[PDB]
Paper text:
The 4-methoxyphenyl and indole ring systems of Fragments 23 and 24 overlap perfectly, while the 6-boronic acid group of fragment 24 partially extends into the SAM adenine pocket and makes hydrogen bonds with the backbone amides of residues Tyr136 and Leu138 and further water-mediated hydrogen bond contacts to the backbone amides of Val131, Ile133, Gly134 and the side chain hydroxyl group of Ser132. Compound AW1 (Kd 0.11 mM, LE 0.36, IC50 0.23 mM), formed by merging the two fragments, adopts a similar conformation to that of the original fragments in the [name] SAM site, as shown in Figures 3B, C and Supplementary Figure S4, thereby providing a new chemical scaffold for further structure-guided development. While the observed fragment hits and the corresponding merged compound AW1 satisfy many of the predicted protein-hotspot interactions, the map also suggested further potential interactions that could stabilise elaborated fragments. AW1 occupies Hotspot 1 at the base of the [name] active site, where it satisfies the hydrogen-bond donor requirements by interacting with the backbone amide oxygen atoms of Gly134 and Tyr136. The merged compound AW1 also orients its pyrazole nitrogen atom in the acceptor map in this region where it forms a hydrogen bond with the backbone NH of Leu138. The compound could be elaborated further towards the methionine end of the active site and by further extension to the second hotspot region at the top of the active site. Structure-guided elaboration of the merged compound AW1 (Kd 0.11 mM, LE 0.36, IC50 0.23 mM) was performed, initially utilizing the indole nitrogen as a vector for growth.
[name] ([name]-(N(1)G37) methyltransferase) is an essential [name] modification enzyme in bacteria that prevents +1 errors in the reading frame during protein translation and represents an attractive potential target for the development of new antibiotics. [name] belongs to a distinct class of S-adenosyl-l-methionine (SAM)-dependent methyltransferases known as the SpoU-[name] (SPOUT) RNA methyltransferase superfamily or Class IV methyltransferases. Each non-crystallographic 2-fold symmetry-related protomer of [name] interacts in an antiparallel manner and consists of two domains: a larger N-terminal domain spanning residues 1–161 and a smaller C-terminal helical domain (177–242) connected by a flexible inter-domain linker. The SAM binding region of [name] is located at the base of the N-terminal domain and consists of a deep trefoil knot architecture, made of three distinct untwisted loop regions.
Residue numbers in the entry:
A (entry chain A): 0 to 159, 178 to 227
B (entry chain B): 0 to 17, 28 to 44, 47 to 159, 177 to 232
The structure:
Amino acid sequence: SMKIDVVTIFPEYLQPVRQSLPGKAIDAGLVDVAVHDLRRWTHDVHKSVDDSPYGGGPGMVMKPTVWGDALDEICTSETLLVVPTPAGYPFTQETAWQWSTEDHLVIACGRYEGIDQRVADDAATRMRVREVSIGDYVLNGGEAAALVIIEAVLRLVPGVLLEGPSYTRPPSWRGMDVPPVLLSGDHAKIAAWRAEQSRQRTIERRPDLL
Amino acid sequence: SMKIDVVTIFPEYLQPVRGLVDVAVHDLRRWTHDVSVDDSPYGGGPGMVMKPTVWGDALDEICTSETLLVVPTPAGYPFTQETAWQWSTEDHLVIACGRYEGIDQRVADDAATRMRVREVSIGDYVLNGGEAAALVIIEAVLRLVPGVSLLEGPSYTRPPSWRGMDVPPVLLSGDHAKIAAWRAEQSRQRTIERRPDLLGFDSP
Ligand SMILES: Nc1cc(-c2ccc3cc[nH]c3c2)n[nH]1
Ligand SMILES: Nc1cc(-c2ccc3cc[nH]c3c2)n[nH]1
């Protein structure tokens, strides 16, 4: 039973993932993903969501008054507020598992040079707030990160070393045969072979994990 | 000038991409023949594996020897900002999006005999397929295309006082040197707290 609210100035970005949800989970009321246009909470006829940064610098900062009103309406005491940012704590599988048991996630998607820091700081005085990064690269905004987090979390909600290579038919293709051990019927040996493949791949690609 | 082709069994998922660059999305099922792209794994295991035959045909049509073939996978080399800068100079990226339990390894191995191949992970979490990773890679790369360390500290804008929370006074002081020093300090503090690995310290 999880509800996810996403707030963004580009609601159309999230539309595919909304549609991608299985009806059986939606009908069972096990999951609901709602997307909100941040501009619903703007104060002015120009629907302004950003303003110049204090202390100077490039780009713009999203307005605290707008975000404050949005979160006031959408969040409750039980909300886990997720704020994607390149400066965040790392979002990992452990994080995804933890958040998969939450009743209400709100994902605040920033743009430009991010959201006025007081928004998160204020919210943290009455709900749990998690500023997170999905990887060491910079995006244009939080929307792609939201898609990633939603996918990684929801697939752990029941109802909705590195892995080595996998193979399927045909046994020979473009001069390459499936490793004979996999067709050996020696399942103890197959397990040992897969372990070694995983070890070698981890050494080559992710020595940090060792 | 960059071309990006994405191959997927779920082309509709890639609508979120909304003259220096063209992005094209191809339905993998276009290269099937009889009225299945997946089969059970050799050696056992849960789930299904995408057959190499259909992928080979698709990539034969879409790739050239100059192509950088990108294959999202949880077991990939890390995709980082450095990678994004590197790929931002490429003429042609092809992103092969897996589903099920992944793609038969021979697809990448075969392709690597004709072109450069990069199996990459966008982070240490598991997705349902390569499509979300493709969106992340495309965004991170295209923003670096010509014509298109430490953690950043907090940013602020008007009003200077909000809900009884004040913008740090130094930011209103107009003293460029003091502001630079404060921002550097905030960045160091944030990096130590959130990403100590970036400064060569142990992770929590
Ligand atoms: N891991 C990661 C997060 C982001 C991100 C998140 C929000 C915003 C808002 C403006 N730029 C942003 C970038 N980039 N990379
Ligand atoms: N970094 C990361 C990549 C993926 C990914 C990529 C392709 C497939 C195909 C089936 N599941 C997949 C997962 N998850 N997390």
